[model samples]
Target: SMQEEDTFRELRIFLRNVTHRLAIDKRFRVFTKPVDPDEVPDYVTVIKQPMDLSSVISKIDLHKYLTVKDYLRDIDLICSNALEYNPDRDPGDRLIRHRACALRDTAYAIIKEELDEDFEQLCEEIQESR
Candidate 1:
């Protein structure tokens, strides 16, 4: 119980920071909302499970995420969907693809460059104590 609670808290803070950083960026506008079939009718068909930053935020707010991996899965989906839908057709398509790549890079950068070494170190300590 305690471990689950602590892990969830870590995920909550980390995910929220990710959303705040990338979701608020101007370059991420297209990714900020759900993909509208009105704009691209094929999008609904192409991306069976569409994801967006706001939706991620909503899920985080609702405590729908049980772990960091769960929250990051949506981020991966958001990028993956865009990469799948746009495969070097038009400049517009290329632009969205680029943004999606950028989203993944930026988010992953924080996880690698900025997330808690302290927590990981604690885990390592326990493992070696065995």
Candidate 2:
């Protein structure tokens, strides 16, 4: 129990810092997404804002990195690109819609980059201890 509690405490601290950093950036918008309560992870909180999440996502830039900086860049690009798409595109411009959808998907590819990095590191550490 104590070990689990300690793990949770550390996760809470990590989340607090993540939230503070994300919130301080005017570009983040922090638009909420629906999550099943039982499926919610320990390190994130979903908070709604009166903003289009797609708009926020379209601004992210895709990049490769070993840390959160790259993660944020990827997020910015996602938000920026999402704003460019019209889900109901005209038949004549199917290519336009296809390209826009590709870009939007690329942006989403890194939406959880930070969390993935942390999990990877955690796994590495656990493995080292074995």
Candidate 3:
């Protein structure tokens, strides 16, 4: 439908801006958990590719992304007190907050495609949970 296409167009534009920012930001290195070198997924190979942002964007569903963003937010909040006692943790917390904001904005843009009272309520519920 036309509405869905328009939604996709908007999403693409938003993602483009995000990718541009990410590319310019040297601090945002894509990290992976410790694993045997031979077991790494092929997708991980392209995360640093200049043309790979679209591929990454396509793989992220809005709900899952939002869930991750919420988790990051929780971590940031939990570390808030630790930061005051030890400023050394500030950089890690800042990065988490930055990524959370990006994911949150992306999720918001995706949700806006079907914006309605029900969706708004769902967002509120999710937000209040943690």
Number of the top-ranking candidate, with lDDT as the measure: 1
Report lDDT per candidate. Answer: 0.81, 0.40, 0.40
Instruction: Please give, for residues 33-56, the per-residue lDDT of candidate 2 as tens digits.
Output: 322347545312422222233333
Cα lDDT tens digits for candidate 1, 56-122: 9999989787655566789999999988988887999899999999998888888788767676465
Model 2 scores a C-alpha lDDT of 0.40
Given candidate 3, what's the lDDT at residue 126? 51
- What does the lDDT come to for candidate 1? 0.81
Error of 3 at 39 (Å): 11
By TM-score: ranked, best first = 1, 3, 2
Residue 113 lDDT, candidate 1, scale 0-100: 83
**Model 1 misplaced regions, further than 4 Å:** 117-130
Could you give candidate 3's per-residue lDDT for residues 42-116 as a string of tens digits? 423533322223333443334223323332343233233223322444786566555544544543554456345
Better of 1 and 3 by TM-score: 1
Best by TM-score: 1
- Candidate 2 minimal-lDDT segment of 10 residues: 57-66
